[PDB]
């Protein structure tokens, strides 16, 4: 039987294709994650229907300890796989089963070019430049949970003033960086995509942590280990590298 | 609840401690993997008995598909865990389980500073500078199996002349780079360790792939998922980073 794949629109992972007529079904979508799913299908031999997660969230826990987003779809067995830039984290791995990573990344800083700011510590030791993250994403959670002094200082700042420094989504964060004196704490692979397309933006510093994106499955799924082996095949043959090059390349920035 | 741990001597992961008297048991060893095992045992609450793998190998298949090394120890249920710089690969994932990675790396090139060589394609297009890898290791297997034209070229060269360009172990490769006109294809984390200590050597180019080290267990082990959760905890608290800095940092280079 056909697997249900939960996902979420996020450039360049999953995007609506451009067409002069209304689109239906899997034909609605293109992107790195659709290519990955096509290759995982080619290897494992399953059919699949792609379904956008109905609440438009990745997966976080609230105050009752209730999950939402793609994580919840898997928990409830309303999806077989989640194929998205879903960060592999301690809290999520307790509740679902991720494949080994198809991409490796870290938190870093998106800001304007031409400034003297060079690191997270440069941000933390000042208050003039505002900085934040996407509310309730894994980057925000990293800062909330950190016991490293610099990151504690940064969390105090972000969470201050009813979290006015946080943004609802990455596009809001990018526009805030482009318009105002603001730096966004963002996953490095998204920074790479953005800076290839807006030439006034740059990554500040290196990666402050290390983590991966993996395919999510419900706990106990037999697909998890089969997908890990397929991912390793695609990596070792250079296919993942080719797919990243295809979707990230921008041709307009120095 | 004492787990049997198979491992292998490899700087700075597992080393003999220095003492004026003979050492016994787990007290024989120190290094990043011993620190990791201490942290995992604190989180998960197990005792452990460390045993060097009797044949002194990581794990590779022969012609008949038979395995050796730490991988074979796990297959035969002679150990509960393998804790070492054991690269997570397609062929090993078919026969053992691994935790998610505690370190992420790629193949790169170890060579001398101040030469014209900038990339693997610089090596592939010539025959004057010899280059190779540790025989039967994951790096050699990467080249053997690659269909990328550059890496096929490189494999043809490495395997020529009864594999004269290959070496038996990393220390042999390091001495050959120091003495002769030779470049070693080596996992990037080992290159970092080496170049901290040999100021006339450098990494050439970037990473030509992406992979991790994981804790190995027999297929079906319940510890694999528990160890993954412990590793993510250690990563997110910044402990893995601190552990790397502790074992890697050298005395500085002029
Ligand atoms: C696009 C966003 C909301 C997602 C992508 N990965 C992270 C996640 O899976 O939580 C989030 C980004 C972040 O928190 O920087
Ligand atoms: C130290 C060596 C022989 C090991 C370490 N990881 C690789 C493995 O697990 O196969 C080998 C290195 C390599 O192949 O470059
Ligand atoms: Cl069309
Ligand atoms: Cl849908
Ligand atoms: Cl021993
Ligand atoms: Cl896993
Ligand atoms: K249209
Ligand atoms: K899990
Ligand atoms: K496996």
């Amino acid at each position: 039987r056909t697997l249900i794949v939960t996902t979420i629109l996020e450039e360049p992972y999953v995007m609506y294709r451009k067409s002069d007529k209304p689109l239906y079904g899997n034909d609605r979508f293109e992107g790195y994650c659709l290519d990955l799913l096509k290759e995982l299908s080619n290897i494992l031999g399953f059919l699949y229907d792609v379904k956008l997660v109905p609440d438009g969230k990745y997966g976080a826990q609230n105050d009752k300890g209730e999950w939402n987003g793609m994580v919840k779809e898997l928990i409830d067995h309303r999806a077989d796989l989640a194929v998205a830039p879903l960060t592999i984290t301690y809290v999520r791995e307790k509740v679902i089963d991720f494949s080994k990573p198809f991409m490796t990344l870290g938190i870093s800083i998106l800001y304007r070019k031409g400034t003297p700011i060079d690191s997270a510590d440069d941000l933390a030791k000042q208050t003039k430049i505002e900085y934040g993250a996407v509310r309730d994403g894994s980057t925000m959670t990293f800062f909330k949970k950190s016991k490293i002094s610099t990151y504690e200082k940064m969390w105090a700042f972000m969470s201050s003033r009813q979290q006015s420094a946080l943004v609802k989504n990455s596009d809001e964060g990018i526009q805030r960086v482009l318009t105002t004196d603001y730096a966004l704490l963002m996953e490095s692979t998204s920074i790479e995509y953005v800076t290839q397309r807006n030439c006034n933006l740059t990554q500040i510093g290196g990666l402050i942590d290390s983590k991966g994106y993996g395919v999510g499955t419900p706990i106990g799924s037999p697909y998890r280990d089969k997908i890990t082996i397929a991912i390793l095949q695609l990596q070792e043959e250079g296919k993942l590298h080719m797919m990243k090059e295809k979707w990230w390349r921008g041709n307009g920035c120095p």
Side-chain angles (χ1 to χ4, degrees), chain A:
Chain A
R1 61 143 194 112
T2 299
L3 307 187
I4 301 309
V5 179
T6 188
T7 191
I8 194 168
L9 289 185
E10 177 61 23
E11 301 180 19
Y13 302 94
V14 182
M15 302 180 283
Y16 277 141
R17 287 209 303 115
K18 289 310 161 258
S19 174
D20 295 346
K21 60 175 166 65
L23 300 178
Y24 299 93
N26 295 346
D27 193 50
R28 283 172 294 167
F29 305 117
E30 63 180 352
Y32 172 97
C33 277
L34 282 303
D35 283 6
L36 176 65
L37 195 48
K38 280 204 188 52
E39 299 289 334
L40 292 175
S41 204
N42 181 58
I43 289 160
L44 296 183
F46 58 85
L47 298 172
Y48 57 90
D49 287 332
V50 173
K51 177 177 182 317
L52 294 172
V53 52
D55 69 8
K57 298 160 168 183
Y58 281 81
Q61 262 187 124
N62 65 21
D63 271 352
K64 285 210 266 87
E66 180 89 317
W67 287 89
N68 62 11
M70 291 182 283
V71 171
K72 184 55 157 156
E73 294 302 287
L74 292 170
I75 287 167
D76 288 346
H77 293 197
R78 287 196 298 274
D80 298 284
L81 305 181
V83 183
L86 183 64
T87 306
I88 301 170
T89 64
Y90 172 88
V91 283
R92 292 174 176 161
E93 186 79 66
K94 291 168 104 186
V95 298
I96 55 170
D97 277 4
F98 279 104
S99 74
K100 286 209 173 53
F102 57 86
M103 202 172 280
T104 280
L105 59 134
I107 292 168
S108 189
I109 296 160
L110 181 70
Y111 193 46
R112 303 184 316 278
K113 266 190 197 171
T115 87
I117 300 294
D118 200 42
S119 68
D121 181 44
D122 284 347
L123 286 180
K125 73 175 164 159
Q126 60 87 62
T127 53
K128 191 166 168 178
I129 299 156
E130 290 201 314
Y131 54 88
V134 173
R135 190 175 287 106
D136 294 333
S138 298
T139 298
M140 190 213 76
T141 296
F142 171 87
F143 286 95
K144 185 177 172 180
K145 276 145 51 127
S146 188
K147 296 273 167 171
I148 301 289
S149 105
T150 296
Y151 305 149
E152 289 176 319
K153 194 139 279 136
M154 290 172 73
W155 176 239
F157 182 89
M158 289 182 219
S159 54
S160 72
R161 304 161 306 156
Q162 311 91 55
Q163 298 184 339
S164 61
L166 302 188
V167 294
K168 281 181 293 183
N169 58 66
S170 294
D171 284 345
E172 179 183 356
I174 298 162
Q175 289 307 311
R176 201 168 164 179
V177 172
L178 287 161
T179 301
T180 68
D181 198 8
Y182 179 84
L184 178 67
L185 279 289
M186 179 180 237
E187 287 170 343
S188 58
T189 40
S190 289
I191 298 179
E192 285 157 7
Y193 183 75
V194 167
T195 60
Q196 287 273 308
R197 288 163 178 76
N198 196 301
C199 313
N200 303 50
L201 305 184
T202 195
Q203 180 176 302
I204 300 300
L207 274 52
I208 78 168
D209 68 353
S210 176
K211 62 191 93 214
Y213 296 145
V215 172
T217 72
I219 293 165
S221 173
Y223 289 97
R224 189 262 292 267
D225 286 336
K226 289 181 181 173
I227 287 166
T228 282
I229 288 159
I231 287 169
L232 289 162
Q233 183 179 326
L234 292 167
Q235 195 289 141
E236 293 176 17
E237 76 196 5
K239 188 48 163 193
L240 300 185
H241 179 72
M242 296 179 38
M243 287 166 49
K244 188 166 176 207
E245 282 191 320
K246 173 182 179 183
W247 293 102
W248 263 251
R249 171 51 64 243
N251 77 335
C253 285

Coordinates of all heavy atoms in Angstrom, one line a residue, chain A residues 27-65:
Chain A
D27 N 2.1 16.1 -8.0 CA 2.5 17.1 -9.1 C 2.5 18.5 -8.6 O 3.0 19.4 -9.3 CB 1.6 16.9 -10.3 CG 2.2 17.6 -11.5 OD1 3.4 17.4 -11.8 OD2 1.4 18.3 -12.2
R28 N 1.9 18.8 -7.5 CA 1.9 20.1 -6.9 C 3.3 20.6 -6.6 O 3.5 21.8 -6.6 CB 1.0 20.2 -5.6 CG -0.5 20.3 -6.0 CD -1.2 20.1 -4.6 NE -1.0 18.8 -4.0 CZ -1.3 18.5 -2.8 NH1 -1.9 19.4 -2.0 NH2 -1.1 17.2 -2.3
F29 N 4.2 19.7 -6.3 CA 5.4 20.0 -5.5 C 6.7 19.7 -6.2 O 6.8 18.8 -7.1 CB 5.4 19.1 -4.2 CG 4.2 19.3 -3.4 CD1 3.4 18.2 -3.2 CD2 3.8 20.5 -2.8 CE1 2.2 18.2 -2.4 CE2 2.7 20.6 -2.0 CZ 1.9 19.5 -1.8
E30 N 7.7 20.5 -5.9 CA 9.1 20.2 -6.3 C 10.1 20.6 -5.3 O 9.7 21.4 -4.4 CB 9.4 20.8 -7.7 CG 9.4 22.4 -7.6 CD 9.8 23.0 -8.9 OE1 10.2 22.3 -9.9 OE2 9.7 24.3 -9.0
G31 N 11.3 20.1 -5.4 CA 12.3 20.6 -4.4 C 13.2 19.4 -4.0 O 13.0 18.3 -4.4
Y32 N 14.2 19.7 -3.1 CA 15.2 18.8 -2.8 C 14.5 17.6 -2.1 O 14.8 16.5 -2.4 CB 16.1 19.5 -1.7 CG 17.1 18.5 -1.1 CD1 18.4 18.4 -1.6 CD2 16.7 17.7 0.0 CE1 19.4 17.5 -1.0 CE2 17.6 16.8 0.6 CZ 18.9 16.7 0.1 OH 19.8 15.9 0.7
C33 N 13.5 17.9 -1.3 CA 12.8 16.7 -0.6 C 12.0 15.9 -1.5 O 11.9 14.7 -1.3 CB 12.0 17.3 0.6 SG 13.1 17.6 2.0
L34 N 11.4 16.4 -2.5 CA 10.7 15.6 -3.5 C 11.7 14.8 -4.3 O 11.4 13.6 -4.6 CB 9.9 16.6 -4.5 CG 8.6 17.1 -3.9 CD1 7.7 16.0 -3.5 CD2 8.8 18.1 -2.8
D35 N 12.8 15.3 -4.7 CA 13.9 14.5 -5.3 C 14.4 13.4 -4.4 O 14.5 12.3 -4.9 CB 15.1 15.4 -5.7 CG 14.8 16.2 -6.9 OD1 13.6 16.2 -7.5 OD2 15.8 16.9 -7.4
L36 N 14.6 13.7 -3.1 CA 15.0 12.6 -2.2 C 13.9 11.5 -2.1 O 14.2 10.4 -2.1 CB 15.2 13.3 -0.8 CG 15.5 12.3 0.4 CD1 16.9 11.6 0.1 CD2 15.5 13.0 1.7
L37 N 12.6 12.0 -2.0 CA 11.6 10.9 -1.9 C 11.6 10.1 -3.2 O 11.4 8.9 -3.1 CB 10.3 11.7 -1.6 CG 9.0 11.0 -1.2 CD1 9.2 10.0 -0.1 CD2 8.1 12.2 -0.8
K38 N 11.7 10.7 -4.4 CA 11.8 9.9 -5.7 C 13.0 8.9 -5.7 O 12.9 7.8 -6.3 CB 12.1 10.9 -6.8 CG 10.9 11.6 -7.3 CD 11.1 12.1 -8.8 CE 9.9 13.0 -9.2 NZ 9.8 14.0 -8.2
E39 N 14.1 9.2 -5.1 CA 15.2 8.3 -5.0 C 15.0 7.2 -4.0 O 15.3 6.1 -4.2 CB 16.5 9.1 -4.7 CG 17.0 10.2 -5.8 CD 17.4 9.6 -7.1 OE1 17.9 8.5 -7.1 OE2 17.3 10.3 -8.1
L40 N 14.4 7.6 -2.8 CA 14.1 6.6 -1.8 C 13.0 5.6 -2.3 O 13.1 4.4 -2.0 CB 13.5 7.3 -0.5 CG 14.6 8.1 0.3 CD1 13.9 8.9 1.4 CD2 15.7 7.3 0.8
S41 N 12.1 6.1 -3.1 CA 11.1 5.3 -3.8 C 11.8 4.3 -4.8 O 11.5 3.2 -5.0 CB 10.1 6.1 -4.6 OG 8.9 5.4 -4.8
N42 N 12.8 4.9 -5.5 CA 13.6 4.1 -6.6 C 14.3 2.9 -5.9 O 14.5 1.9 -6.6 CB 14.6 5.0 -7.3 CG 15.3 4.2 -8.4 OD1 14.7 3.6 -9.3 ND2 16.6 4.2 -8.3
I43 N 14.7 3.1 -4.7 CA 15.5 2.1 -4.0 C 14.7 1.1 -3.2 O 14.9 -0.2 -3.3 CB 16.5 2.8 -3.0 CG1 17.6 3.5 -3.8 CG2 17.2 1.8 -2.1 CD1 18.4 4.6 -3.1
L44 N 13.7 1.6 -2.5 CA 12.9 0.7 -1.6 C 11.6 0.1 -2.2 O 11.1 -0.9 -1.7 CB 12.5 1.5 -0.4 CG 13.8 1.9 0.4 CD1 13.5 2.6 1.6 CD2 14.7 0.7 0.7
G45 N 11.2 0.8 -3.3 CA 10.0 0.3 -4.1 C 8.7 0.5 -3.3 O 7.9 -0.4 -3.1
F46 N 8.4 1.7 -2.9 CA 7.1 2.1 -2.4 C 6.5 3.2 -3.2 O 7.2 3.9 -3.9 CB 7.1 2.5 -0.9 CG 8.0 3.7 -0.6 CD1 7.6 5.0 -0.7 CD2 9.3 3.5 -0.1 CE1 8.4 6.1 -0.4 CE2 10.1 4.6 0.2 CZ 9.7 5.9 0.0
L47 N 5.1 3.2 -3.2 CA 4.4 4.3 -3.7 C 4.1 5.3 -2.6 O 4.1 4.9 -1.4 CB 3.1 3.9 -4.4 CG 3.2 2.9 -5.6 CD1 1.9 2.4 -6.0 CD2 3.9 3.7 -6.7
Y48 N 3.8 6.6 -2.9 CA 3.6 7.5 -1.8 C 2.7 8.7 -2.3 O 2.6 9.0 -3.5 CB 5.0 8.1 -1.4 CG 5.8 8.8 -2.4 CD1 5.7 10.2 -2.7 CD2 6.7 8.0 -3.2 CE1 6.5 10.8 -3.8 CE2 7.5 8.6 -4.2 CZ 7.3 10.0 -4.5 OH 8.1 10.5 -5.5
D49 N 1.9 9.2 -1.3 CA 1.1 10.4 -1.5 C 1.7 11.4 -0.5 O 2.0 11.1 0.7 CB -0.3 10.2 -1.1 CG -1.0 9.3 -2.1 OD1 -0.6 9.4 -3.3 OD2 -2.0 8.6 -1.8
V50 N 2.0 12.6 -1.0 CA 2.6 13.7 -0.2 C 1.4 14.5 0.3 O 0.5 14.9 -0.4 CB 3.5 14.6 -1.1 CG1 3.9 15.8 -0.3 CG2 4.7 13.8 -1.6
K51 N 1.4 14.8 1.6 CA 0.3 15.5 2.3 C 0.9 16.6 3.1 O 1.7 16.3 4.1 CB -0.5 14.5 3.1 CG -1.6 15.1 3.9 CD -2.3 14.1 4.7 CE -3.5 14.6 5.5 NZ -3.0 15.9 6.1
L52 N 0.6 17.9 2.9 CA 1.1 19.0 3.7 C 0.5 18.8 5.1 O -0.7 18.5 5.3 CB 0.7 20.4 3.2 CG 1.3 20.7 1.8 CD1 0.7 21.9 1.3 CD2 2.8 20.8 1.9
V53 N 1.4 19.1 6.1 CA 0.9 18.9 7.5 C -0.2 19.9 7.8 O -0.1 21.1 7.5 CB 2.1 19.1 8.5 CG1 2.9 20.4 8.2 CG2 1.7 18.9 9.9
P54 N -1.4 19.5 8.3 CA -2.5 20.3 8.3 C -2.3 21.6 9.2 O -2.9 22.6 8.8 CB -3.6 19.5 8.9 CG -3.3 18.1 8.5 CD -1.7 18.0 8.5
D55 N -1.6 21.5 10.3 CA -1.3 22.7 11.1 C -0.2 23.6 10.6 O 0.1 24.7 11.2 CB -1.3 22.4 12.6 CG 0.0 21.6 13.0 OD1 0.9 21.4 12.1 OD2 0.0 21.2 14.2
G56 N 0.6 23.2 9.6 CA 1.7 24.0 9.1 C 2.9 24.1 10.1 O 3.7 25.1 9.9
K57 N 3.1 23.2 11.0 CA 4.2 23.2 12.0 C 5.1 22.0 11.8 O 4.7 20.9 11.4 CB 3.6 23.2 13.4 CG 2.7 24.5 13.7 CD 1.8 24.1 14.9 CE 1.1 25.4 15.5 NZ 0.3 24.9 16.7
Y58 N 6.3 22.2 12.3 CA 7.3 21.1 12.3 C 7.1 20.1 13.4 O 7.0 18.9 13.2 CB 8.7 21.7 12.5 CG 9.2 22.2 11.1 CD1 8.8 23.5 10.7 CD2 10.0 21.4 10.3 CE1 9.3 23.9 9.4 CE2 10.4 21.9 9.0 CZ 10.1 23.1 8.6 OH 10.5 23.6 7.3
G59 N 7.0 20.6 14.6 CA 6.8 19.7 15.8 C 7.5 20.3 17.0 O 8.7 20.3 17.1
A60 N 6.6 20.8 18.0 CA 7.1 21.2 19.3 C 6.1 20.9 20.3 O 5.0 20.5 20.0 CB 7.3 22.7 19.3
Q61 N 6.5 20.9 21.5 CA 5.7 20.6 22.7 C 5.3 21.8 23.3 O 6.1 22.8 23.5 CB 6.5 19.8 23.7 CG 6.5 18.4 23.6 CD 7.2 17.7 24.8 OE1 6.7 17.0 25.5 NE2 8.5 18.1 24.9
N62 N 4.0 21.9 23.7 CA 3.5 23.0 24.5 C 3.6 22.7 26.0 O 4.4 21.8 26.5 CB 2.1 23.3 24.2 CG 1.1 22.1 24.5 OD1 1.4 21.2 25.3 ND2 0.0 22.1 23.8
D63 N 2.8 23.4 26.8 CA 2.7 23.3 28.3 C 2.1 22.0 28.8 O 2.5 21.5 29.9 CB 2.1 24.5 28.9 CG 3.1 25.6 29.1 OD1 4.3 25.3 29.0 OD2 2.7 26.8 29.5
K64 N 1.1 21.4 28.1 CA 0.6 20.1 28.5 C 1.5 19.0 28.1 O 1.2 17.8 28.5 CB -0.8 19.9 28.0 CG -1.9 20.7 28.7 CD -3.3 20.0 28.7 CE -4.2 20.5 27.6 NZ -4.0 19.7 26.3
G65 N 2.6 19.3 27.4 CA 3.4 18.3 26.8 C 2.8 17.6 25.6 O 3.1 16.5 25.2

